[PDB]
Design a protein around this ligand. Sequence first.
Ligand SMILES: NC(=O)CC[C@H](N)C(=O)O
Lengths: 242, 200
Amino acid sequence: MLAKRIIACLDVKDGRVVGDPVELGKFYSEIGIDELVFLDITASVEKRKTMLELVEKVAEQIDIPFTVGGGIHDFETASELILRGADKVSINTAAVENPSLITQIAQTFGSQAVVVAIDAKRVDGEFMVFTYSGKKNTGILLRDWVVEVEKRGAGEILLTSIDRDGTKSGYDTEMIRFVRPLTTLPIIASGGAGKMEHFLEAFLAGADAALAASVFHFREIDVRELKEYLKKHGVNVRLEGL
Amino acid sequence: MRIGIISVGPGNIMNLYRGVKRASENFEDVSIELVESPRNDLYDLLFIPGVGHFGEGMRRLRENDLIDFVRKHVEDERYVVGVCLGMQLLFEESEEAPGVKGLSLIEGNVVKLRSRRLPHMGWNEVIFKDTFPNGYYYFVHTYRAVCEEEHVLGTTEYDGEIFPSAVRKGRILGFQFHPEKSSKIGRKLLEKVIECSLSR
Ligand SMILES: NC(=O)CC[C@H](N)C(=O)O
């Protein structure tokens, strides 16, 4: 049966994890991470070709899917990074400001290739969509954005609950449930994970995958131990063996 | 061991190349060539990869004269292995390409999956009848093959529906998932495929 995905997120800069990103991702593949996601913070002048060598390097040695993002602002950018070897790109601001960008990506490289990143926040009792690294209220309802995202062709939603991010308070399972019946797109929860229990919850709320950053890198949760755990609580995950 | 990987076909083919190259690391005399056109001689192992629509598949083969080439490979009992869209092209016709004829190398047809969440994207579990190792491999597809049981090699289940995630007819092999993106178990499968073609 289909496995609940455990996704790891690395921040890159000048081709370096803010180790060697190819190195660490290869190691994450050997310990049983299901997918990698690189969020890129290189300056503005350098981003273009740096993001290209990153993809170029990762794609030479990684044996699992990987997503690239950070400041992917147009189709040209999206196009060079996919033709370079990235399995998909993530778009957020440029997705909201220009939703045909999603269809241009989906139609050219397949829906598989577009991960749309949504950052919602509860405002006046509503789930509202924010852009510019969580800094602008677009005044667009999550519910409205989630349906449009599917309808435009995207393959997946990376759903981040702004306020939960960094808290260790757990995933925004209320947000997940609100989003859950609204779309058939696989859902990735991001921001809040602190302990193995939290993964279960997000999965029970109907998330298709769970993403984390530090806790994986800095080792509060074990990938191996996280899955067997999850496995013990009725969640169907991928589990190597030896 | 002369290995071919057809490089015309749509979508990314280099990951397959890179993983086939990885899988072959420990073998003697490994040559792995990107095949864009028919060659004077035949390979020992010929890969047909693919990501995209069935029609593009056949056309990039046809435009480049690879139908007879892939065909002459079957006539001389050489290993031919379809990967993702490649597996589907191995069949006769497909719902995804209403007028378009497959290689028709294995009997059957291709049909849309039954789920409301298409494509079937992510890690799903493959069970084989032999040879290849059971476990989780990474998938991305909206369509599925329909063949007789004597041809089913590997089984998968997605939202209740059981379909061939792998197929086989003599030296013709087809895989639906992406070995190149299925981690350690994916090399393992790829090594095994190579190992099959070391034999005759
Ligand atoms: N993703 C692919 O291109 C695989 C083959 C086919 N187009 C499908 O979706 O089933």
